[model samples]
Target: LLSDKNVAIIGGGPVGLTMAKLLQQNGIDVSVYERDNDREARIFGGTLDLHKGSGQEAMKKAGLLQTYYDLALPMGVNIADEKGNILSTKNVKPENRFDNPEINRNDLRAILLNSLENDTVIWDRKLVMLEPGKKKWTLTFENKPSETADLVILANGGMSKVRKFVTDTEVEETGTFNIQADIHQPEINCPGFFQLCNGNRLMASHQGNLLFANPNNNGALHFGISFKTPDEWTQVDFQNRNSVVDFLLKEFSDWDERYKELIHTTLSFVGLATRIFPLEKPWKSKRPLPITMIGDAAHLMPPFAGQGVNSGLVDALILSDNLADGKFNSIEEAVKNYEQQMFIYGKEAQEESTQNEIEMFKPDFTF
Candidate 1:
């Protein structure tokens, strides 16, 4: 058994917090250091459908399935045309649809964080560097000095700083940009357009541009407008909402009026959707250390498959199981085995997400 091993979990998102709770429950001491100061410091992204085999299964294994169900927002998914015509619907049944239930990213994080022991997560501890010692790993945070641990698990998100110490993989920006906006009381504020959504997600794509809208739990509607652009397009100024709207309308000149109406009525916060281009091959290190990575740090990919967080949760489950099962003699062996399996699975997911992104924004201009 791991016995007295001091484990440090970086990132404090769903993956890291889930890993900490699972490991701590299994008698391993785990600490999570998060960069964010508080839960509401920044708006976590939109909702996610936790798939059956990967995301929900991990929650079940971690014994947090009920909490997840209680807190998650299980919204039905609907595909629509640019003119707001419904094409298909993925209805959610009370019993069977829990597998891919839609949950807000912020709510999921809060649920995972609440499941852990008190003081288990050290907030505002932004990891800056990793220092290797004879028997432990030292982590220097951006403000809170430094701490050492017997094992360091990198569960940070896609744009992780901890990844540099474990691998030399470079992150490439996918030539796509997105704007995320939350419309308060969408039905009241934008009645005609809100009625078009019908309490489900609406997605429409045409001419390399896509617009997605979903209903939030707080009577708000979250909208995302994704499009392909030049490599340097992110450098442009998007803080001006009027200019952004103008630019987007011009970019999707041929889109139906319904899409424009959705944008015109809603208040939006514009941001870039940066996709990470992972290394083509698995990164191998010759050094023998108890330090390793999971989640986006190991394999950052695009969000087309919605597998980024799911894959990280899976990584935690598998790695924790290996540690609990005593599957390897040394930590290094376990680390290597986890990395190898992660590399294979991560690559497959990456390829699938890439394909999904391409097909999602096809020129045919369907929902």
Candidate 2:
């Protein structure tokens, strides 16, 4: 019986928090280590929609499905021309109403953070190194006291430095760069652009360039501009907002003026990143301790098919079951079982994501 064994989960993202929720609910001891300075840290990306049979299933297992539904907004998709004219829309229907609703990343975090036992997540603890021991592993964090645990779960992220213990594969970019732009109170600042959304998610593309606009929070607008990174293009120093805006303006120069409003009215830049990491290699099971990965830390992929977080949730689901189901003799035995099954399903998701990424730049591609 696995009794009183300290289980440490790194990364307090949805996957990590969900992992803590599931295992903790099963009477297992679990704690999460996150790099955020505090729970109120505004250090996350945009909204996410949990798909049924995947992300939703995991939420159901954690008994927070109702909370997700209450806070989530049902959103449809709008496909538009570069001219900002709508071409088509997948309107929300009554039957499929609950299919995929959008929830702000922060709200999702609160849902899990509040549900967990207080202090389940050790904030301000950025993992810097790890030294495995005989029966436990030494976890060292930046500017914080070290902790020990019998089982270690690393969900730090795709580009996590801790990945060295689990795999030797290097994170690779998908040749695409996304400049995430955010507009606060768009209803007043950028009314035209806000109206174009029509209370739904919006997608527009031109000449291999793609733009996704959404009403992430109340009166808050979020847009993601994606394109094949030009060979010589360098990262923009975002402190000077004009430089980033100029780059976007020139990049989308041929598009309609309305689309340019997104570039002009951006209150701030949320982030600029490239699609980095994929399941390029199988996760090695022969480990120094009971450690593995979940979410983007496991299989990082382009968000083309929206399978990245969904697959990660599936990983949490199966992995939590294996570790706490009491069907395995040892913790390592449970992890090995999880890894073997993850390979098949996780690879399938990566394959589909890779294909969708390829099709994104094609002229004939549509949402």
Candidate 3:
């Protein structure tokens, strides 16, 4: 359906690049516009665990599943108590090791970028405006000339400015706040927590506050603390290192001393209030051209169930198949079909995330 069409995909995140790879493999001419200055740009985040049926399936179809397996770490999970005591450890079984493994953001990006053709990604181009022409869409970037494409796919993110051109639903804040901190050298900086982790992911929850620590994330120890957003926290400044540390120390004061030690030797901190883009509201059908979204751009949900990116990969998978040659009569028809299926699966993912979020933060919650 896209043989003679120039496809433009905005945003170069994992899902965007995955969509580009899938479409390119199907003989479609695709270009990804990324805001990063170059391919070597650094992404700050925690490791991603690609599940069996969703993300793994997408990678398998893109011919990069084995590559992902080669680079992913099959670390186990360690459940802990409020006192930093190990309650139990769920080791990865030999038969089901590949069901879901952790992979760093940089490594996953490298795998996707290395599989695509040269010049397929237009870096340093940030979309400023998107206007529709007679039969094509014109995309204006911040530092470059505008480019016209027959088909435009939005995979940027939940806060995409151009999403208003497609859907009127505003992103809603979930009442939860997440605080992430990284220790440069865990063994030296926080020996207590490092020994507790033992090279595996750790989870601890008490009195509605939760903590998840990944001991080995690209040579650093990365952990996240989440809980209900307090009304008085509006004065907190996330950008200010001292402010975040003080807030965490105060919030988790009654917890273990080891947890305090982990926060004390922190190298960096990131605080964000969770947001969700509901799928109950329908997207606009009548448009100037074939314009749709995938991944977070289409359905943004909390990371409670780890379905955020996995569901997005399923979008790329189904969309690519619908756009395959002879699969549909027209590009619009294929996009319509893709959106229909996306709504069904995406709604389920959002529900799962919502339920998990509710259960995880309860006072009596357990791993």
Tens-digit lDDT track for model 2 on 303-327? 8678778878888899889878879
Q: Residue 37: error of model 3 in Å?
A: 1.1
Q: How would you encode candidate 1's per-residue C-alpha lDDT over 39-149 as one tens digit per residue?
A: 666544677667778878888887878878777666666676656565656564754455767777777878887778898999889998988888888889986789999
* Deviating ranges (above 4 Å) for candidate 2: 88-97, 363-367
Model 1 misplaced stretches (Cα beyond 4 Å): 40-42, 90-98, 277-279, 365-367
Worst 10 residues of 1 by lDDT: 89-98
Candidate 3 per-residue lDDT, tens place, 1-367, comes to 7877889999999999999999999888999999999988888888998888899999999999989988988887888887755655555476344567788999999999999999999999999899998988999999799999999999998888898667888899988999887788789999988988888888889888899999998778989999988877667787787888898888788878888999888867888899899998779888778899999999999996677788899999999888885578888889989999999999998899988998897768854
Residue-pair clashes per prediction, in order, are 0, 0, 0
Candidate 3 to truth, TM:
0.96
lDDT ranking from best candidate downward: 3, 2, 1
Q: What is the C-alpha RMSD of each candidate to the true structure, in Å?
A: 2.1, 1.8, 1.4
Q: Which stretches of candidate 3 lie over 4 Å from their true place?
A: none
For model 3, what is the C-alpha lDDT against the true structure? 0.88
